[PDB]
Design a protein around this ligand. Structure first.
Ligand SMILES: *CCC(=O)N1CCN(c2nc(=O)n(-c3ccccc3C(C)C)c3cc(-c4c(O)cccc4F)c(Cl)cc23)CC1
Ligand SMILES: Nc1nc2c(ncn2[C@@H]2O[C@H](COP(=O)(O)OP(=O)(O)O)[C@@H](O)[C@H]2O)c(=O)[nH]1
Ligand SMILES: [Ca+2]
Ligand SMILES: [Ca+2]
Length: 169
């Protein structure tokens, strides 16, 4: 089977860990230690084809690291996560994409825009803004809630679809 390195990126508190733990362990974690950066394995069937996923849940400090760069370069696809009640995290999306392209020689890197915390009524980022941003980048946009599990499989599955499309090229 094919094996892909996925990387979950985005600002502190957007739900990177909650999304990943939901996918792997099927429960919602409310106070996940923000210093733990770990990877998880999962075998999945998507569009009738099995892939092994190696998923890195990023953390660390707001700092440049040449070693982090090295790890990020090995990623084959990225989830760009923001929270719909956090305008800063949405503004940050552009900068995460800039860093991904930087470390991967400006390749047309497989990416999915993820609007997490879609269960909350406290929205500050309009869906149209997110759709327009994904459109400009030529990437899918998926709305998720790690809390309710809405769209969690979809977000990761869609990223695998993007990697598959890219590796045909
Ligand atoms: C609360 C802990 C947590 O979740 N995080 C999220 C990831 N963190 C983080 N912060 C940050 O400022 N950057 C960054 C560094 C240099 C320039 C621009 C940025 C942001 C605004 C895009 C990163 C950058 C990355 C990163 C790197 O370094 C290379 C390639 C891709 C990439 F996403 C990462 Cl993984 C995490 C950053 C703070 C703690
Ligand atoms: N209401 C709601 N809260 C969430 C969701 N995802 C994460 N959270 C909460 O937001 C906080 C940060 O989540 P976490 O996964 O630790 O964010 P990370 O710093 O990006 O890894 C935690 O208190 C989570 O319980 C969601 O989809 N909906
Ligand atoms: Ca985390
Ligand atoms: Ca440091």
């Amino acid at each position: 089977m094919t094996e892909y390195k996925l990387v979950v990126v985005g600002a502190c508190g957007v739900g990177k860990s909650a999304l990943t733990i939901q996918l792997i362990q099927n429960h919602f974690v409310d106070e996940y230690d923000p210093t733990i950066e770990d990877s998880y394995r999962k075998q999945v069937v998507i569009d009738g084809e099995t892939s092994l996923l190696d998923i890195l849940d990023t953390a660390g400090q707001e700092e440049y690291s040449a070693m982090r760069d090295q790890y990020m370069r090995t990623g084959e696809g990225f989830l760009l996560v923001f929270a719909i009640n956090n305008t800063k995290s949405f503004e940050d999306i552009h900068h995460y994409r800039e860093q991904i392209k930087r470390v991967k020689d400006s390749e047309d890197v497989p990416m999915v825009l993820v609007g997490n915390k879609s269960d909350l009524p406290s929205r500050t980022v309009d869906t149209k803004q997110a759709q327009d941003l994904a459109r400009s980048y030529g990437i899918p946009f998926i709305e998720t809630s790690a809390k309710t599990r809405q769209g969690v499989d979809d977000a990761f599955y869609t990223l695998v679809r993007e990697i598959r499309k890219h590796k045909e090229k």
